[PDB]
Symmetry: C3
Subunit: 155 residues, 3 copies
């Protein structure tokens, strides 16, 4: 067997195929030759591993895009929340201011209701002193007129 470290089936630039080769053992100790059908079988797996890596890559890109979409929506939630927070605060201000000035107009109106009840009391006093001054006057015109009348009939 030619060449003493090597068995040659041609020369550089004039290579030969080796044909009618039985398939060899495929193991970590095999020193059998390998034929093309054995490389083909392996290449079929590799192709399938490659097609599968491509499908996973497409999947992983879309997952990443969905995560970014979800992030966009979390941030719209945040804005909406801040806006509700702000509208609560302005609605807080508008409640007490409005009730504050409803309460100021209640106190002004009680002040003049209290003044009106005072005047009604005072008017009611001097209205009863009048009902007496008018009946003591009425009695003393009667007494007086008929005392004078009495000194007329004395004649």
């Amino acid at each position: 067997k030619t060449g003493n470290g090597t068995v040659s089936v041609g020369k550089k630039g004039k290579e030969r195929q080796i044909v009618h080769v039985g398939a060899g053992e495929i193991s970590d100790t095999s020193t059998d030759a390998v034929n093309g059908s054995q490389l083909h079988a392996l290449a079929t797996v590799v192709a399938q591993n490659k097609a599968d890596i491509k499908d996973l890559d497409d999947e992983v890109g879309l997952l990443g895009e969905e995560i970014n979409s979800l992030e966009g929506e979390i941030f719209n939630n945040q804005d909406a929340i801040a806006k509700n927070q702000a509208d609560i605060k302005t609605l807080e201000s508008n409640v007490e201011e409005g009730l504050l000035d409803l309460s100021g107009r209640l106190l002004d109106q009680k002040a003049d209701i209290d003044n009106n009840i005072n005047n009604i009391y005072e008017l009611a006093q001097q209205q009863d002193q009048h009902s007496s001054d008018i009946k003591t006057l009425k009695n003393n015109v009667e007494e007086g007129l008929l005392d004078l009348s009495g000194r007329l009939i004395d004649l």
Copy 2:
């Protein structure tokens, strides 16, 4: 075995080529290769296959995590919309409750100010009645006194 090919057998009676030393594995190698070299590669391809299947599972779990998040985000959207709507409902209840009270409070404003025009009309009509009583009692005293003074009739000196 011409000068295109070399044959170790025939169809149906192929032969294994045995005691083959490992050949150079490079992009110009014209060496035969042996079965432990193909074995070495096939082990890597097995490992890659196994690793793709682990990776697939992780991708599957990630997808389930993402849909969990989506579900919570949707719950946040709902509650936010319920808050948004309670706030408008409260804002419209507060406008109608203040305006109804400010309306009853200004119908009182007006009816009280009419009571003050009436207390002023009573107070100075009552102040004429006081001076009418005085000038009435004065003219009574003055009119009886001058009748009594018409005793001049009966005057035994």
Copy 3:
């Protein structure tokens, strides 16, 4: 060499390389020997698949971290949303309590104003009667005085 199931190019421990082997047919029926550049081409693809699987594992690991950080924004939004739910119900009750209290004040002012109307009316009726009593008393003492002197010039 030939041992009828095998062709030998060496022996155990003194195996030889076959050289100047032209590329065999790669196909599922092929009985061509394969050479080193044919296995090298395939291993190149296996290396790329291995590189791709690692990159993808790294990408999938960053998305897992991304997802985790978003979880934390979601639970913060839930805190904020809950705070807002409380503040709104707290504000609802303050608004109800505040406008109920102001309503009480307005009814007790309405009470003392229609009493003021009842009393201002009563005063006016008692006051227009005084206008009655003062004018009749006037022309009743006018009538009394002028008949006493009507009779006292009868002398």
